[PDB]
Tab-separated table of N, CA and C in Angstrom:
chain	number	residue	atom	x	y	z
A	1	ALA	N	142.420	52.400	177.591
A	1	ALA	CA	143.378	53.966	178.119
A	1	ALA	C	142.976	54.701	178.760
A	2	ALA	N	141.408	54.911	178.646
A	2	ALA	CA	140.676	55.439	178.986
A	2	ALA	C	140.527	55.176	180.435
A	3	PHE	N	139.734	54.053	180.475
A	3	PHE	CA	139.310	53.262	182.324
A	3	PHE	C	140.645	52.806	182.600
A	4	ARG	N	142.166	52.857	182.344
A	4	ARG	CA	142.982	52.568	183.228
A	4	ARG	C	143.594	53.558	183.531
A	5	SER	N	143.482	54.872	183.013
A	5	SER	CA	144.040	56.417	183.298
A	5	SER	C	142.981	56.926	184.406
A	6	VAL	N	141.657	56.583	184.614
A	6	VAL	CA	141.055	56.862	185.701
A	6	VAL	C	140.823	56.038	186.987
A	7	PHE	N	140.724	54.523	186.060
A	7	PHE	CA	140.238	53.762	187.148
A	7	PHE	C	141.992	53.245	187.564
A	8	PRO	N	141.773	52.491	189.038
A	8	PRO	CA	141.147	52.146	190.608
A	8	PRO	C	140.832	53.563	191.274
A	9	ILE	N	140.037	53.298	192.093
A	9	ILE	CA	139.482	54.544	193.039
A	9	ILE	C	139.578	54.203	193.826
A	10	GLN	N	140.801	54.596	194.975
A	10	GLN	CA	140.459	54.729	196.386
A	10	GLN	C	138.955	55.678	197.064
A	11	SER	N	138.496	55.034	198.041
A	11	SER	CA	137.872	56.081	198.467
A	11	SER	C	138.425	57.414	199.585
A	12	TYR	N	138.272	58.349	200.294
A	12	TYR	CA	138.085	59.238	201.215
A	12	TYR	C	139.182	58.766	202.335
A	13	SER	N	138.471	57.456	202.738
A	13	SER	CA	138.324	56.924	203.613
A	13	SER	C	139.445	55.485	203.867
A	14	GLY	N	140.287	55.569	202.673
A	14	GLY	CA	141.145	54.738	202.237
A	14	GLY	C	140.574	53.256	202.869
A	15	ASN	N	139.407	52.940	202.401
A	15	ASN	CA	138.590	51.566	202.961
A	15	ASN	C	138.394	50.866	201.648
A	16	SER	N	137.708	51.309	200.645
A	16	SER	CA	137.328	51.006	199.753
A	16	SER	C	137.776	51.632	198.278
A	17	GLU	N	137.770	50.637	197.439
A	17	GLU	CA	138.401	50.857	196.324
A	17	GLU	C	137.647	50.262	194.928
A	18	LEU	N	137.133	50.915	193.923
A	18	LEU	CA	136.622	50.545	192.719
A	18	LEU	C	137.198	50.455	191.475
A	19	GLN	N	137.802	49.017	190.776
A	19	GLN	CA	138.313	49.271	189.891
A	19	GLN	C	137.620	48.472	188.539
A	20	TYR	N	138.717	48.483	187.413
A	20	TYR	CA	138.132	48.129	186.419
A	20	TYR	C	138.389	46.818	185.678
A	21	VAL	N	137.999	46.202	185.198
A	21	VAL	CA	138.096	44.615	184.619
A	21	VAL	C	137.885	44.805	183.448
A	22	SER	N	137.128	44.634	182.634
A	22	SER	CA	136.868	44.858	180.719
A	22	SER	C	135.380	45.422	180.715
A	23	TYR	N	135.478	45.575	179.439
A	23	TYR	CA	134.355	46.192	178.617
A	23	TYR	C	133.825	45.108	177.552
A	24	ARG	N	132.644	45.238	176.914
A	24	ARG	CA	131.734	44.723	175.864
A	24	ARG	C	130.652	45.356	175.571
A	25	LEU	N	130.778	45.690	174.014
A	25	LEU	CA	129.707	46.454	173.677
A	25	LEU	C	128.694	45.587	173.775
A	26	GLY	N	127.402	45.757	173.418
A	26	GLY	CA	126.082	45.128	173.588
A	26	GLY	C	125.846	45.307	172.268
A	27	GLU	N	124.949	44.346	171.903
A	27	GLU	CA	124.450	44.570	170.102
A	27	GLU	C	123.582	45.889	170.238
A	28	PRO	N	123.590	46.435	169.262
A	28	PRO	CA	122.672	47.995	169.006
A	28	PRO	C	121.139	47.455	168.843
A	29	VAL	N	120.293	47.961	169.543
A	29	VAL	CA	119.279	47.701	169.437
A	29	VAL	C	118.332	47.221	167.867
A	30	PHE	N	118.859	48.455	166.849
A	30	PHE	CA	117.794	48.206	165.862
A	30	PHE	C	119.220	48.118	164.701
A	31	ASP	N	118.672	48.259	163.693
A	31	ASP	CA	119.803	47.980	162.496
A	31	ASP	C	120.100	49.334	162.020
A	32	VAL	N	121.034	49.475	161.237
A	32	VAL	CA	121.121	51.087	160.543
A	32	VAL	C	120.057	51.416	159.707
A	33	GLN	N	119.103	51.405	158.804
A	33	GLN	CA	118.524	51.324	157.924
A	33	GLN	C	117.426	51.709	159.009
A	34	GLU	N	116.926	50.743	160.158
A	34	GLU	CA	116.069	50.721	161.267
A	34	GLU	C	116.578	52.221	161.795
A	35	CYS	N	117.255	52.771	162.186
A	35	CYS	CA	117.537	53.595	163.284
A	35	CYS	C	117.892	55.195	162.152
A	36	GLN	N	117.830	54.943	160.884
A	36	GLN	CA	117.950	56.411	160.219
A	36	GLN	C	115.729	56.112	159.546
A	37	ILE	N	114.884	55.013	159.570
A	37	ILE	CA	113.951	55.367	159.273
A	37	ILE	C	113.014	56.001	160.888
A	38	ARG	N	113.651	55.184	162.140
A	38	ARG	CA	112.557	55.280	163.121
A	38	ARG	C	113.194	57.021	163.329
A	39	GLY	N	114.815	57.311	163.295
A	39	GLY	CA	115.257	58.814	163.580
A	39	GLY	C	115.700	58.940	164.988
A	40	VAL	N	116.268	57.662	165.346
A	40	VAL	CA	117.075	57.459	166.540
A	40	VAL	C	118.363	56.956	166.220
A	41	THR	N	119.367	56.810	167.238
A	41	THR	CA	121.151	56.197	167.197
A	41	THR	C	121.048	54.841	166.658
A	42	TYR	N	122.012	55.214	165.892
A	42	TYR	CA	122.580	53.429	165.442
A	42	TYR	C	123.669	53.631	166.740
A	43	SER	N	123.092	53.089	167.915
A	43	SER	CA	123.994	52.966	168.869
A	43	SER	C	124.474	51.785	169.542
A	44	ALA	N	125.391	51.496	169.987
A	44	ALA	CA	125.867	50.102	170.857
A	44	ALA	C	125.832	50.700	172.272
A	45	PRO	N	125.557	49.877	172.757
A	45	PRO	CA	125.283	49.712	174.169
A	45	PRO	C	126.552	49.346	175.138
A	46	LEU	N	126.963	49.814	176.385
A	46	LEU	CA	128.539	49.439	176.796
A	46	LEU	C	128.455	49.013	178.511
A	47	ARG	N	128.876	47.775	177.925
A	47	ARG	CA	128.658	47.067	179.592
A	47	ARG	C	129.720	47.172	179.821
A	48	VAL	N	130.340	46.942	181.029
A	48	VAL	CA	131.793	47.170	181.834
A	48	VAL	C	131.917	46.492	182.910
A	49	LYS	N	132.362	45.128	183.120
A	49	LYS	CA	132.514	44.452	184.302
A	49	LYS	C	133.629	44.794	185.148
A	50	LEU	N	132.694	45.248	186.696
A	50	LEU	CA	133.383	46.184	187.511
A	50	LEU	C	133.734	45.053	188.617
B	1	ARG	N	121.366	66.362	223.236
B	1	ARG	CA	123.018	67.258	223.897
B	1	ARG	C	122.182	67.300	225.277
B	2	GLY	N	121.036	67.693	225.650
B	2	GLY	CA	120.817	67.574	227.129
B	2	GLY	C	120.139	66.811	227.690
B	3	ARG	N	120.100	65.717	227.146
B	3	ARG	CA	119.730	64.232	227.584
B	3	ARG	C	120.780	63.834	228.648
B	4	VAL	N	121.525	64.026	229.270
B	4	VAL	CA	122.903	63.458	230.063
B	4	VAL	C	122.889	65.245	230.962
B	5	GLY	N	123.301	64.900	231.999
B	5	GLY	CA	123.887	66.027	232.887
B	5	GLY	C	123.048	65.419	234.182
B	6	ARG	N	122.547	66.582	234.868
B	6	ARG	CA	121.696	66.474	236.282
B	6	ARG	C	122.269	65.572	237.500
B	7	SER	N	123.581	65.794	237.175
B	7	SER	CA	124.327	64.890	238.309
B	7	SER	C	125.446	65.966	238.532
B	8	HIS	N	126.599	65.613	239.239
B	8	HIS	CA	127.272	66.454	239.709
B	8	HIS	C	129.068	65.407	239.179
B	9	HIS	N	128.780	65.409	238.056
B	9	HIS	CA	129.915	64.513	237.694
B	9	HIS	C	130.171	65.211	235.870
B	10	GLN	N	131.414	65.412	235.433
B	10	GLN	CA	131.637	65.692	233.922
B	10	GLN	C	131.160	65.075	233.228
B	11	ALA	N	130.086	65.224	232.212
B	11	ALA	CA	129.597	64.495	231.026
B	11	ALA	C	130.128	64.683	229.757
B	12	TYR	N	130.298	63.697	229.015
B	12	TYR	CA	131.058	63.643	227.613
B	12	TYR	C	130.340	63.409	226.730
B	13	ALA	N	129.703	64.282	225.509
B	13	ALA	CA	129.036	63.778	224.071
B	13	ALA	C	130.043	63.674	222.741
B	14	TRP	N	130.002	62.688	222.126
B	14	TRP	CA	131.097	61.877	221.031
B	14	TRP	C	130.007	61.820	219.936
B	15	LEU	N	130.505	62.920	218.887
B	15	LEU	CA	129.737	63.180	217.990
B	15	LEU	C	130.739	62.613	216.455
B	16	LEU	N	130.070	61.313	216.045
B	16	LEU	CA	131.344	60.475	215.293
B	16	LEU	C	130.666	61.092	213.425
B	17	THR	N	131.609	62.012	213.347
B	17	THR	CA	131.639	62.555	211.345
B	17	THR	C	132.301	61.840	210.435
B	18	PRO	N	131.816	61.761	209.605
B	18	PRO	CA	132.230	60.767	208.278
B	18	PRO	C	133.842	61.681	207.862
B	19	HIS	N	133.999	61.334	206.675
B	19	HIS	CA	135.157	62.126	205.803
B	19	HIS	C	134.483	63.387	205.781
B	20	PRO	N	135.320	64.539	205.987
B	20	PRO	CA	134.650	66.197	205.308
B	20	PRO	C	134.305	65.878	204.364
B	21	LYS	N	134.846	65.561	202.928
B	21	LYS	CA	134.495	65.544	201.901
B	21	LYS	C	132.675	64.853	201.432
B	22	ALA	N	132.855	63.392	202.642
B	22	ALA	CA	131.996	62.530	202.601
B	22	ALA	C	130.655	63.215	203.045
B	23	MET	N	130.703	64.191	204.098
B	23	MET	CA	129.590	64.634	204.401
B	23	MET	C	128.936	65.388	203.732
B	24	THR	N	127.808	65.863	203.723
B	24	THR	CA	126.742	66.926	203.219
B	24	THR	C	126.951	67.764	203.756
B	25	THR	N	126.540	69.427	203.056
B	25	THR	CA	126.527	70.383	203.092
B	25	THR	C	125.706	70.773	204.112
B	26	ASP	N	124.728	70.358	204.269
B	26	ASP	CA	123.341	70.615	205.150
B	26	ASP	C	124.572	70.399	206.668
B	27	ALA	N	124.827	69.427	206.671
B	27	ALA	CA	125.572	68.628	207.985
B	27	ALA	C	127.216	69.073	207.993
B	28	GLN	N	127.618	69.644	207.586
B	28	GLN	CA	128.551	70.691	207.411
B	28	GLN	C	128.371	71.816	208.223
B	29	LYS	N	127.773	72.486	208.121
B	29	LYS	CA	126.811	73.549	208.978
B	29	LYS	C	126.104	73.242	210.084
B	30	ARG	N	125.851	72.340	210.386
B	30	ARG	CA	125.089	71.717	211.367
B	30	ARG	C	126.402	71.292	212.435
B	31	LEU	N	127.030	70.507	211.840
B	31	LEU	CA	128.288	70.420	212.861
B	31	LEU	C	129.192	71.491	212.860
B	32	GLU	N	129.256	72.586	212.513
B	32	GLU	CA	129.808	73.455	212.679
B	32	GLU	C	129.117	74.403	213.607
B	33	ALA	N	128.101	74.668	213.616
B	33	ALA	CA	126.855	75.440	214.835
B	33	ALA	C	127.266	74.587	215.849
B	34	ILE	N	127.280	73.234	215.588
B	34	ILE	CA	127.142	72.880	217.149
B	34	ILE	C	128.935	72.112	217.494
B	35	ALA	N	129.908	72.978	216.952
B	35	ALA	CA	131.162	72.544	216.886
B	35	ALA	C	131.148	74.247	217.910
B	36	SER	N	131.003	75.188	216.923
B	36	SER	CA	131.126	76.080	217.535
B	36	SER	C	130.604	76.737	218.605
B	37	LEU	N	129.307	76.667	218.791
B	37	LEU	CA	128.189	76.661	219.743
B	37	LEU	C	128.406	75.947	221.003
B	38	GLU	N	128.929	75.792	221.734
B	38	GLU	CA	128.917	75.044	223.448
B	38	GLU	C	129.303	74.927	224.591
B	39	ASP	N	128.324	75.732	224.779
B	39	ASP	CA	128.344	76.113	226.135
B	39	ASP	C	126.683	76.481	226.842
B	40	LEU	N	126.393	76.465	227.725
B	40	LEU	CA	124.755	76.905	228.482
B	40	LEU	C	123.944	77.653	227.557
B	41	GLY	N	122.535	77.355	227.353
B	41	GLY	CA	121.857	78.318	227.001
B	41	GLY	C	121.726	78.313	225.688
B	42	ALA	N	122.781	77.154	224.802
B	42	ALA	CA	123.048	77.332	223.153
B	42	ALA	C	121.749	77.043	222.679
B	43	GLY	N	120.656	76.347	223.121
B	43	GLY	CA	120.036	75.442	221.977
B	43	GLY	C	118.853	76.907	221.252
B	44	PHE	N	118.354	77.899	222.231
B	44	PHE	CA	117.970	79.411	221.603
B	44	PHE	C	118.914	79.704	220.376
B	45	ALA	N	120.185	79.873	220.311
B	45	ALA	CA	121.407	80.127	219.261
B	45	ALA	C	121.520	79.105	218.416
B	46	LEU	N	121.349	77.930	218.950
B	46	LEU	CA	121.106	76.931	217.985
B	46	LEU	C	119.689	76.768	216.983
B	47	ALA	N	118.403	77.593	217.694
B	47	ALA	CA	117.372	77.412	217.012
B	47	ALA	C	117.509	78.596	216.190
B	48	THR	N	118.082	79.705	216.252
B	48	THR	CA	118.470	81.004	215.828
B	48	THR	C	118.794	80.596	214.856
B	49	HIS	N	119.739	79.907	214.817
B	49	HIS	CA	120.678	79.577	213.284
B	49	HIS	C	119.968	78.334	213.100
B	50	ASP	N	119.349	77.619	213.604
B	50	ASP	CA	118.425	76.576	212.121
B	50	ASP	C	117.463	77.417	211.715
C	1	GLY	N	155.154	69.778	160.088
C	1	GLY	CA	155.110	68.814	161.418
C	1	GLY	C	155.336	69.274	162.652
C	2	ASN	N	154.291	70.574	162.991
C	2	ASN	CA	153.928	70.882	164.221
C	2	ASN	C	152.682	70.810	164.384
C	3	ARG	N	152.039	70.271	163.336
C	3	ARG	CA	150.218	70.181	163.556
C	3	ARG	C	150.293	68.701	162.634
C	4	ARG	N	149.042	68.297	164.198
C	4	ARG	CA	148.435	66.977	164.216
C	4	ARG	C	146.871	67.187	163.823
C	5	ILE	N	146.941	65.955	162.973
C	5	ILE	CA	145.817	65.380	162.804
C	5	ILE	C	145.057	64.621	164.481
C	6	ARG	N	143.867	65.130	164.575
C	6	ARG	CA	142.925	64.353	165.780
C	6	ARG	C	141.967	63.600	164.914
C	7	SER	N	141.863	62.880	164.708
C	7	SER	CA	140.638	62.096	163.843
C	7	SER	C	139.436	61.572	164.762
C	8	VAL	N	138.647	60.852	164.095
C	8	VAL	CA	137.516	60.698	164.948
C	8	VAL	C	137.736	60.169	166.404
C	9	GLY	N	138.630	58.840	166.238
C	9	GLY	CA	139.143	58.176	167.747
C	9	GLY	C	139.337	58.888	168.732
C	10	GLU	N	140.548	59.945	168.293
C	10	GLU	CA	141.195	60.563	169.963
C	10	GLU	C	140.241	61.765	170.473
C	11	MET	N	139.014	62.403	169.695
C	11	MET	CA	138.256	63.014	170.139
C	11	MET	C	137.150	62.621	171.164
C	12	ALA	N	136.724	61.365	170.367
C	12	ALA	CA	135.896	59.838	170.387
C	12	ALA	C	136.489	59.847	172.216
C	13	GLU	N	137.522	59.585	172.282
C	13	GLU	CA	137.842	59.225	173.670
C	13	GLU	C	138.601	60.118	174.698
C	14	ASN	N	138.566	61.309	173.887
C	14	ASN	CA	138.513	62.614	175.140
C	14	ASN	C	137.857	62.812	175.884
C	15	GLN	N	136.406	62.878	174.885
C	15	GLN	CA	135.109	63.335	175.719
C	15	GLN	C	134.684	62.195	176.078
C	16	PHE	N	135.138	60.975	175.826
C	16	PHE	CA	134.580	59.657	176.787
C	16	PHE	C	135.722	60.022	178.424
C	17	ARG	N	136.840	60.519	178.025
C	17	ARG	CA	137.715	60.616	179.326
C	17	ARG	C	137.138	62.165	180.297
C	18	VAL	N	136.640	62.777	179.559
C	18	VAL	CA	135.728	63.674	180.160
C	18	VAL	C	134.576	63.635	180.972
C	19	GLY	N	133.673	62.625	180.112
C	19	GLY	CA	132.423	62.145	180.783
C	19	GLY	C	132.603	61.377	182.176
C	20	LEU	N	133.660	60.555	181.936
C	20	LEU	CA	134.257	59.548	183.098
C	20	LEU	C	134.586	60.245	184.359
C	21	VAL	N	135.472	61.335	184.432
C	21	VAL	CA	135.508	62.521	185.003
C	21	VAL	C	134.694	62.828	185.990
C	22	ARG	N	133.403	63.221	185.724
C	22	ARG	CA	132.336	63.899	186.461
C	22	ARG	C	131.870	62.006	187.118
C	23	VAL	N	131.735	61.112	186.087
C	23	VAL	CA	131.777	59.637	187.071
C	23	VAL	C	132.406	59.378	188.235
C	24	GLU	N	133.754	59.742	187.860
C	24	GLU	CA	134.779	59.595	188.948
C	24	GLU	C	134.390	60.240	190.149
C	25	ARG	N	134.243	61.197	190.051
C	25	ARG	CA	133.749	62.419	191.025
C	25	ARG	C	132.614	61.703	191.681
C	26	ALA	N	131.503	61.460	191.187
C	26	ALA	CA	130.500	60.913	191.842
C	26	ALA	C	130.829	59.618	192.381
C	27	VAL	N	131.409	58.975	191.928
C	27	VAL	CA	131.604	57.225	192.808
C	27	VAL	C	132.588	57.964	194.160
C	28	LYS	N	133.227	58.941	193.890
C	28	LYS	CA	134.122	59.509	194.690
C	28	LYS	C	133.307	59.916	195.978
C	29	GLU	N	132.326	60.473	195.643
C	29	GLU	CA	131.873	60.783	196.996
C	29	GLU	C	130.795	59.983	197.146
C	30	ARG	N	130.154	58.812	196.688
C	30	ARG	CA	129.497	58.236	196.765
C	30	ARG	C	130.522	57.225	197.808
C	31	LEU	N	131.161	56.247	196.856
C	31	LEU	CA	132.108	55.356	197.764
C	31	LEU	C	132.712	55.717	198.937
C	32	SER	N	133.498	57.485	199.345
C	32	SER	CA	133.401	57.117	200.624
C	32	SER	C	132.499	57.738	201.386
C	33	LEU	N	131.123	58.183	200.964
C	33	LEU	CA	129.911	58.052	201.774
C	33	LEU	C	130.029	56.574	201.971
C	34	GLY	N	129.150	55.886	203.631
C	34	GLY	CA	129.808	55.020	204.074
C	34	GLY	C	128.358	54.049	203.976
C	35	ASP	N	128.458	52.878	204.790
C	35	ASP	CA	127.250	52.278	204.850
C	35	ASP	C	127.559	50.964	203.510
C	36	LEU	N	128.939	50.749	202.964
C	36	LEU	CA	129.217	50.117	201.606
C	36	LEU	C	129.119	49.038	201.667
C	37	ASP	N	128.979	47.918	202.590
C	37	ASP	CA	128.457	46.611	202.715
C	37	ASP	C	127.416	46.369	201.629
C	38	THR	N	126.339	46.857	201.547
C	38	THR	CA	124.844	46.856	200.707
C	38	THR	C	125.516	46.881	199.506
C	39	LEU	N	126.272	47.462	199.022
C	39	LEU	CA	126.575	48.680	197.739
C	39	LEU	C	126.930	47.361	196.571
C	40	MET	N	126.763	47.738	195.528
C	40	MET	CA	126.687	46.821	194.599
C	40	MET	C	126.668	47.905	193.322
C	41	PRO	N	128.016	47.664	192.297
C	41	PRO	CA	128.685	48.455	191.341
C	41	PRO	C	127.770	49.160	190.754
C	42	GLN	N	126.536	49.156	190.654
C	42	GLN	CA	125.360	49.580	189.833
C	42	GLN	C	125.094	51.046	190.096
C	43	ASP	N	124.863	50.972	191.111
C	43	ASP	CA	124.077	52.793	191.626
C	43	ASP	C	125.026	53.687	192.170
C	44	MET	N	126.166	53.254	192.732
C	44	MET	CA	127.380	54.642	192.770
C	44	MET	C	127.472	55.607	191.160
C	45	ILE	N	127.654	54.119	189.983
C	45	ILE	CA	127.726	54.724	188.938
C	45	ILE	C	126.543	55.093	188.358
C	46	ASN	N	126.503	56.251	187.687
C	46	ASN	CA	125.596	56.915	186.938
C	46	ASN	C	126.139	56.844	185.399
C	47	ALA	N	124.802	56.445	184.350
C	47	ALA	CA	125.251	56.706	183.161
C	47	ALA	C	124.838	57.806	182.150
C	48	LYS	N	124.187	58.807	183.077
C	48	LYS	CA	123.626	59.935	182.590
C	48	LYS	C	124.988	60.863	182.664
C	49	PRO	N	125.783	61.327	183.104
C	49	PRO	CA	127.240	61.912	182.799
C	49	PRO	C	127.785	60.994	181.487
C	50	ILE	N	128.146	59.952	181.131
C	50	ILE	CA	128.740	59.482	180.180
C	50	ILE	C	127.652	59.656	178.935
């Protein structure tokens, strides 16, 4: 709903347009317990094909 | 701008600008300076505003 | 019946939305900026605002 509510994007010269296809969450770089040990985020990277 | 002239014929100068939101702020003031100021002896005033 | 629960999902989606608002402004100015032929969908967007 967010990507559809923002995208697709005209340029100001009505010449180029950037649209959306799909997203996919990357694998988190560490485990949860490891992220508590090191002191950094258990975060999943987001990769979107545009 | 002083490159042409030196003859008995009306010369013309054609200045391509992008979309007004697309051009940068310094480029804006550059173009408004040279649009506002177009007559003889301008460059000293142009340097003065530079 | 007049007060509504906004749980974890809706605020996260809204903050993702307002983060994507700065991204779309950046790609507005960059995508409307020309020389678009050699441009890939990597350098218009920036992951810093998201």
